[PDB]
């Protein structure tokens, strides 16, 4: 119902899977008994997400973060819908959705 909301939910899932990929990357990078920075990484992500000055800024960051996430199936299923959602829509609402995803990935683990 209200396919725009469906696209919004699948975008939330896409961002969650991308952050999962980046978490796997940082967990692979850390070595020895050092505590893998996850809280630090999450706070850094939130701080960089808040820091943005329209259009090019934070959209370049969104795309770069999604690429850093790597293989993401939810984005694989739906190409045109998410591509149009990212190209369209005011960037602030995309920021809202991404921050909600930040808080909604924790269900996964």
């Amino acid at each position: 119902n209200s396919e725009e909301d469906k696209q919004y939910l699948i975008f939330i899932k896409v961002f969650q899977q991308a952050m999962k990929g980046n978490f796997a990357k940082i967990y692979a990078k850390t070595e020895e008994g050092k505590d893998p920075p996850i809280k630090k990484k999450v706070e850094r992500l939130r701080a960089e997400l808040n820091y943005c000055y329209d259009e090019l800024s934070f959209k370049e960051y969104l795309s770069d973060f999604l690429v850093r996430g790597g293989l993401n199936k939810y984005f694989n299923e739906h190409q045109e819908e998410i591509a149009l959602l990212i190209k369209k829509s005011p960037w602030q609402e995309i920021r809202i959705w991404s921050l909600l995803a930040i808080a909604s990935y924790k269900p996964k683990d």
Binding site: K29, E48, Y51, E60, Y61, D64
Partner: protein, 285 residues
């Protein structure tokens, strides 16, 4: 009487990477933003220039509350409680505790890059083989001459004599915070437009202009010259010194123009000495 010294100052041409924003993933992004005519110009933080002036005051003797260690890279306070009466640093720049909180005698504007900023990102390698996460790194640089605007409330100074070391530091400005290891940018002025007057109305803002994009001409804005000619900005209160003097003197009918009645010196030190003599006269030093 209240006295104010306003000045638009232009640095020397060169390659600079002074200020960096966020370090996206590998580039140290030069602090850039929109400016006149709607093209991206690089910027130099006024806080960096204030730090440079404070470091100058630290180096040439003087008393400063904040001491730059130069070895621990830490800032130390001579006294936890600030005192503008004694220290030059707290009197000139102010302080916030979160007492007195002062206001700060020196007020400065952010330094814009005369030349528009297009590209020019530097590569970086580290020896060969055994490459780790720190092996590859990019760095942005801009070939321009930065220009910033400052104004000081001399009456606000706790000691009126402290104005002279500030001007001396503005002349011999130390390194401005940036990647000086690979981008050594001298911030010493090469052209000055100073105004020593008793009014709050401060024009003589960013006036130095670039004749040709991607070049180092640095002629003077037509609006500023028109303002000087129209009657405002009294030439007797105008203090011009630097490389722009030659260009001004090669202008046609310069003698007839009111600009010729302004205090112009091709040498910077001569104009600085004359300005300091006038200031000492007007402050009873």
């Amino acid at each position: 009487p209240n006295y104010y010294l306003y000045g638009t100052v232009l640095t020397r041409y060169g390659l600079a990477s002074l200020n960096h924003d966020i370090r996206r993933g590998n580039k140290t992004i030069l602090q850039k933003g929109y400016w006149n005519n709607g093209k991206i110009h690089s910027f130099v933080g006024s806080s960096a220039i204030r730090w440079a002036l404070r470091f100058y005051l630290q180096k040439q003797g003087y008393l400063v509350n904040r001491v730059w260690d130069e070895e621990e890279h830490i800032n130390r306070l001579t006294s936890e409680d600030f005192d503008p009466e004694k220290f030059y640093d707290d009197d000139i720049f102010g302080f916030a505790l979160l007492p007195n909180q002062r206001m700060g005698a020196l007020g400065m504007n952010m330094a814009v890059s005369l030349t528009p900023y297009d590209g020019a990102v530097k590569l970086g390698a580290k020896s060969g083989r055994e490459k780790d996460s720190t092996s590859l790194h990019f760095t942005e640089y801009h070939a321009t001459r930065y220009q910033y605007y400052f104004g000081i409330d001399a009456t606000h100074l706790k000691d009126f004599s402290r104005i002279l070391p500030m001007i001396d530091g503005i002349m011999n400005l130390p390194k401005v915070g940036g990647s000086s290891n690979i981008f050594n940018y001298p911030f010493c002025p090469d052209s000055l437009v100073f105004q020593w007057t008793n009014h709050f109305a401060s024009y003589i803002s960013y006036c130095f202009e670039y004749c040709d994009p991607k070049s180092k001409e640095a002629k003077l804005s037509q609006e500023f010259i028109d303002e000087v000619e129209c009657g405002q900005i009294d030439p007797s209160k105008l203090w011009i010194g630097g490389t722009i003097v030659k260009d001004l003197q090669q202008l046609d009918n310069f003698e007839s123009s009111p600009l010729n009645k302004a205090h112009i010196y091709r040498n910077r030190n001569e104009m600085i000495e004359a300005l300091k003599t006038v200031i000492k006269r007007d402050l009873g030093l």
